Design a protein around this motif. Structure first.
Motif, PDB file in Angstrom:
ATOM      1  N   UNK A 141      28.241  54.034  37.559  1.00 23.68           N
ATOM      2  CA  UNK A 141      29.126  53.154  38.003  1.00 23.68           C
ATOM      3  C   UNK A 141      29.641  51.779  37.078  1.00 23.68           C
ATOM      4  N   UNK A 142      30.483  51.953  36.547  1.00 20.88           N
ATOM      5  CA  UNK A 142      30.646  50.577  35.630  1.00 20.88           C
ATOM      6  C   UNK A 142      32.149  50.044  36.211  1.00 20.88           C
ATOM      7  N   UNK A 143      31.945  48.500  36.617  1.00 20.73           N
ATOM      8  CA  UNK A 143      33.227  47.824  36.908  1.00 20.73           C
ATOM      9  C   UNK A 143      33.310  46.477  36.070  1.00 20.73           C
ATOM     10  N   UNK A 144      34.146  46.617  35.051  1.00 18.49           N
ATOM     11  CA  UNK A 144      34.358  45.673  33.991  1.00 18.49           C
ATOM     12  C   UNK A 144      36.096  45.283  33.817  1.00 18.49           C
ATOM     13  N   UNK A 145      36.418  45.551  34.897  1.00 19.70           N
ATOM     14  CA  UNK A 145      37.958  45.578  35.126  1.00 19.70           C
ATOM     15  C   UNK A 145      38.600  45.548  36.392  1.00 19.70           C
ATOM     16  N   UNK A 146      39.084  44.326  36.771  1.00 22.29           N
ATOM     17  CA  UNK A 146      39.730  43.988  37.980  1.00 22.29           C
ATOM     18  C   UNK A 146      41.107  44.078  38.185  1.00 22.29           C
ATOM     19  N   UNK A 147      41.790  44.223  39.361  1.00 22.26           N
ATOM     20  CA  UNK A 147      42.975  44.347  39.466  1.00 22.26           C
ATOM     21  C   UNK A 147      43.718  43.097  39.586  1.00 22.26           C
ATOM     22  N   UNK A 148      44.917  42.848  39.608  1.00 16.95           N
ATOM     23  CA  UNK A 148      45.552  41.364  39.661  1.00 16.95           C
ATOM     24  C   UNK A 148      45.431  40.658  38.490  1.00 16.95           C
ATOM     25  N   UNK A 149      46.424  40.800  37.615  1.00 17.43           N
ATOM     26  CA  UNK A 149      46.448  39.973  36.498  1.00 17.43           C
ATOM     27  C   UNK A 149      46.790  38.362  36.665  1.00 17.43           C
ATOM     28  N   UNK A 150      45.757  37.396  35.932  1.00 22.09           N
ATOM     29  CA  UNK A 150      46.390  36.016  36.365  1.00 22.09           C
ATOM     30  C   UNK A 150      47.062  35.424  35.138  1.00 22.09           C
ATOM     31  N   UNK A 151      47.823  34.693  35.311  1.00 20.03           N
ATOM     32  CA  UNK A 151      48.742  34.167  34.207  1.00 20.03           C
ATOM     33  C   UNK A 151      48.655  32.353  34.244  1.00 20.03           C
ATOM     34  N   UNK A 152      48.461  32.179  33.126  1.00 17.67           N
ATOM     35  CA  UNK A 152      48.287  30.497  32.943  1.00 17.67           C
ATOM     36  C   UNK A 152      46.883  30.274  32.708  1.00 17.67           C
TER      37      UNK A 152
END
Length: 152
Positions: A141-152
């Protein structure tokens, strides 16, 4: 009427090993630390005295497979052939920095069961490696990428 060659058990194990070696032509696919063990299994048959094998056939198998994050990792499978096989299944112990103490544990416990049910009373070391590459990847189980990119 005499059938086959005496000490079939010894031949039952060696036979496989000899085959596997071929199944894995790669250079870094399978490595055996306890070579002497095999030698004894080959001589014991010729001498037909079944008096020598003092060490268990220990050999690790490195399989390159993907787990997550479109990444790949090596899976070490410490397989050990007892002096009973096919009588008693081997002590295949899968290990990989990827899997943790907890996970790894559960994983192994399963890998063994697979055979106990599917492969029982036969020389099938591959049937396992196949059941691993499949499950293994899952366990990891590897979680190194989340959804919903943030700008700014």
């Amino acid at each position: 009427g005499s059938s086959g060659s005496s000490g079939e058990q010894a031949e039952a194990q060696l036979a496989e090993l000899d085959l596997l070696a071929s199944m894995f032509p790669g250079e870094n696919e399978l490595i055996v630390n306890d070579q002497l063990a095999v030698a004894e299994l080959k001589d014991c048959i010729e001498k037909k005295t079944m008096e020598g094998r003092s060490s268990k056939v220990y050999f690790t198998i490195n399989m390159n497979l993907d787990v997550s994050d479109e990444k790949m990792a090596m899976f070490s499978l410490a397989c050990i052939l007892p002096f009973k096989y096919p009588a008693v299944l081997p002590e295949i112990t899968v290990r990989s920095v990827l899997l943790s103490r907890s996970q790894q544990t559960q994983l192994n416990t399963d890998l063994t069961a697979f055979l106990q049910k599917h492969c029982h009373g036969d020389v099938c070391i591959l049937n396992a490696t196949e059941w691993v590459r499949e499950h293994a990847s899952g366990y990891v189980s590897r979680d190194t990428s989340s959804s919903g990119p943030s700008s700014g």
